[PDB]
Amino acid sequence: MQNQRIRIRLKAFDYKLIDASTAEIVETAKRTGAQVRGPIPLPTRKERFTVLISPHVNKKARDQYEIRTHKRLIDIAGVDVQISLG
Template sequence: MPTETKTKIVAKVPKAKAKPRIKKEEAVAKLRIRVQAYEHKVLDNSVKQIIDTALRYGAIIVGPVPLPTEIKKYTVNRAAFVYKDAREQFEMRVHKRVIDILNPAANVIEALTNLNLPSGVNIDVKML
C-alpha cells in the first residue's frame, strides 16, 4: 500500500493592526476638599455633612479617602532635677480625609461655602 502524506498548507493572513486604545481624558474640572481634625468623630460627621450637601445638588463625588494620620509626639521630663529616666510622652493626632467633586456646578460651590461646620475642623479647597 502506498503511504499518503498529508501536507498542510498554512497561509499567513496579515492581522489588522489594532490601534492602541487610549482613553482621551476630557478636561474635567475637579474640586478637591481636604478636611483635617484632631478628633475623628467630628471629622467623620463633617465629611458626611459635606457629602450630603453635594449630593443634594446632584454632584459626582469620589471619596472620602482617608489619608494617613499624622502623629506628633512630645517627650517631657516628669521631674525637674535628678530623675532623667522618668519621662512622659504626649501625642497629637491629626486625622485627614480627601473628597473630590467632579464637574462642580455653581450652586454646589455656593452651598459648600455656606456650610456651617464645627470648630476644630480645618478645610482646604482646591480647584484642579
C-alpha cells in the first residue's frame, strides 16, 4: 500500500520559534493517532553579508551580519511550513 507519510519541513530564522512549532506539531499528532518519527534537525544555513560601515570611504571598516536559517524535519509568523505527503 503506497506510503503517504507527512514529511514536514519547518524553516525559520529563529531556532526557538521553530522549536515551539516542532512541539506544536508533534504534540498534536500525539494528541490524535499518529507516530511522528520526528523532529530531525537538518543543517542550519548561515548567509553572511560583509557590508561597509562608512557612508564614504574607510574600506577596512566593515560590519558582518548573518541570517541563520534553522530547518527541522517531522516525518509523521517566522516559521515556514512545507507539508509533503509523498
